[PDB]
């Protein structure tokens with residue numbers, strides 16, 4: 126832990142805090158209600174979810190190291206250049222500083238020639254260049270390893286599924302809103318954005334051509350084909366085929382939701398029955414993911430709970446109240462779709478679904494943030510698939 | 518070096534940087550030229566000089582520790598709770614954050630009931646309370662030791678002059694502008710500040726009653742009586758009486774400058790000869806301080822220079838270019854009064870002297886910042902007065 130690393134963590138976090146405060150006041154007074162900020166909020170939602178994911182990943186690394194979860198061995202990392210929690214904090218703070226600066230430029234641009242729609246383009250271009258620049262520049266080993274995983278994950282059936290690919294595909298399943306916002310940005314730039322004044326002022330926000338449904342299922346599709354690939358590599362259907370069923374429930378939920386969204390303008394009487402199908406399949410998917418979590422993912426609700434009631438018999442975390450709060454919050458957050466459909470169906474507030482998605486996306490990232498702790502703890506305690514050698 | 522200490526250093530410095538940037542832009546556009554900002558700049562000049570002194574003191578501690586200057590033994594400190602450079606950085610960053618917040622409130626106040634003239638009052642009241650609050654609160658040992666020294670220094674003839682009192686009195690001699698601004702704040706509040714709207718909009722800026730001359734000489738008076746006290750304790754006139762002469766040159770310079778400032782309105786023909794006396798005594802004082810610095814204070818220009826030309830024979834700092842640049846910059850900064858009188862006499866710009874003092878006060882703090890390095894290095898190498906036991 127070099128002194129300048131912690132200094133950069135604190136420096137970036139302090140600049141981040143002051144910039145978030147400045148953003149809040151700028152939105153309160155400086156921002157004008159005439160321009161619609163929904164495309165802006167979606168693009169910067171993708172960015173902010175990435176930054177929040179990096180912060181929570183640093184917290185996860187901190188918890189794993191101070192609890193005993195040997196995530197270095199689980200992730201198959203070299204124990205020489207493994208990224209510490211502080212380094213993830215610098216990455217998150219750096220990208221958050223550029224996020225805040227780009228958003229502030231979108232609020233007020235202190236340049237007369239440079240337009241506003243380039244600031245997000247420049248921001249995400251800097252993210253991509255930071256990820257893929259060939260030179261041995263900032264954190265070269267980390268992003269090279271991440272780029273290798275990003276290549277292996279998106280071409281899943283042709284590579285043997287190790288733990289790193291699984292884990293990253295699950296994080297992508299949590300961060301599907303980032304892919305959603307990337308697709309929305311591309312569609313908005315190519316079709317709706319008038320390259321004249323700004324990005325303020327929609328044929329890309331809905332499922333008109335069904336492309337967004339494909340983007341929704343892309344993480345689910347990768348996980349599904351990884352389960353099938355693991356079936357081919359090891360003929361054992363009990364974990365893998367049921368997990369693939371768990372992801373195909375997501376497939377069915379997404380396609381029925383898209384079908385209802387398309388049919389709401391068609392006027393077909395089958396719209397109501399498609400809504401029924403979407404609701405029941407959302408129930409099935411929510412219970413399927415929740416049960417899989419608490420049983421096979423976290424390993425809780427074991428038959429050998431003992432003193433640790435409603436839990437397993439080895440516990441590495443200090444307080445069990447963490448476990449019970451995690452179980453509960455998992456129940457609501459997996460079933461948060463019930464809350465969202467209730468508020469979007471019992472109210473007539475304009476652009477309700479956009480607000481609901483905007484607030485519940487960080488809650489989904491937080492849900493996977495909590496999921497990481499107990500999934501990796503379960504893996505550290507007893508092997509689940511991707512070890513095949515020892516318990517550790 | 519705890520991790521959270523460096524984290525607080527970085528956090529405070531980052532907030533400081535963003536707040537200084539916000540202050541710059543606020544002064545560029547938000548600030549209104551109708552209100553005179555000179556009293557504001559003087560009060561916050563005292564504050565900023567204190568913060569800059571703390572930053573440079575942290576830099577000095579860093580240099581002393583990584584060079585070998587045993588300032589812990591020289592200052593007579595317990596080697597258990599001695600303040601590290603990082604802790605001084607937290608103190609400086611904390612006070613700088615409150616300084617920036619108070620100045621920003623003076624620019625725009627986000628409160629309708631609270632007036633503007635309390636923000637500096639609240640800021641310096643917080644400084645005093647942080648210094649003198651009896652509880653074992655933030656950095657209790659440090660400010661207790663500092664308060665003991667602040668008591669011993671201001672009552673000098675009745676206490677035996679150790680190194681700590683000398684050193685702190687010299688820093689007060691450098692930071693005489695802080696006492697100047699404190700006196701100006703008290704006089705402005707008591708006489709000129711209308712407690713109706715704000716501090717914007719002078720019988721306290723000049724030497725009308727000669728009080729400011731006393732405030733100027735107060736650090737010089739303390740050093741003079743410390744030299745006399747050291748003469749009484751040790752009958753040896755060679756260091757102490759000549760040093761007291763060095764400070765009485767400051768006395769003569771200050772009283773002649775005040776006499777000229779008073780006589781400029783009298784119209785007496787003796788005004789010109791008083792200006793001559795002030796100029797020649799400023800020359801004498803500048804050469805007296807500069808020669809004392811490079812000869813007895815820093816120990817340079819020794820007769821045993823050897824390879825280290827124009828220096829001494831033991832050097833602890835890596836590069837000699839530091840020494841030569843220090844010598845030079847000492848020549849200009851001690852003689853910076855020549856630059857200031859030249860620009861204030863050959864130009865007719867309004868409020869020139871205020872600008873000159875505002876810019877050259879941090880240069881005086883920087884001059885003592887450089888003075889600390891070589892004075893403490895000379896003391897570490899060979900004893901100068903306040904050791905009497907060993908060379909170290």
Ligand SMILES: CCCCCCCCCCCCCCCCCC(=O)O[C@H](COC(=O)CCCCCCCCCCCCCCC)COP(=O)(O)OCC[N+](C)(C)C
Pocket residue numbers: 167168169170171172175182186196200202203206207208216249252253256266267268269270271300303304306307310
């Ligand atoms: C509209 C939204 C558009 C969004 C824009 C597109 C997204 C931009 C993508 C760029 C941002 C990502 C910044 C890169 C941070 C990655 C840091 C990282 O991977 O640290 C990890 C830390 O190691 C760990 O496994 C512990 C924590 C788990 C790390 C999980 C990987 C991080 C995933 C975050 C990026 C996901 C991609 C998101 C795309 C939407 C790699 O470690 P290492 O390489 O340094 O050491 C391994 C030893 N070697 C190297 C020798 C093999």
Ligand SMILES: CCCCCCCCCCCCCCCCCC(=O)O[C@H](COC(=O)CCCCCCCCCCCCCCC)COP(=O)(O)OCC[N+](C)(C)C
Pocket residue numbers: 559560561562563564567574578588592594595598599600608641644645648658659660661662663692695696698699702
């Ligand atoms: C208009 C302007 C008005 C200005 C307002 C008035 C000024 C406000 C005054 C409050 C600000 C000062 C904040 C206090 C910081 C002091 C920190 C400090 O003294 O650290 C020092 C660090 O120790 C050292 O000696 C090394 C560096 C030299 C320290 C020099 C003292 C600092 C002087 C700064 C304040 C000067 C006062 C300025 C008044 C104008 C004390 O160490 P310690 O107490 O922690 O350890 C010693 C062991 N014990 C304690 C057991 C004996």
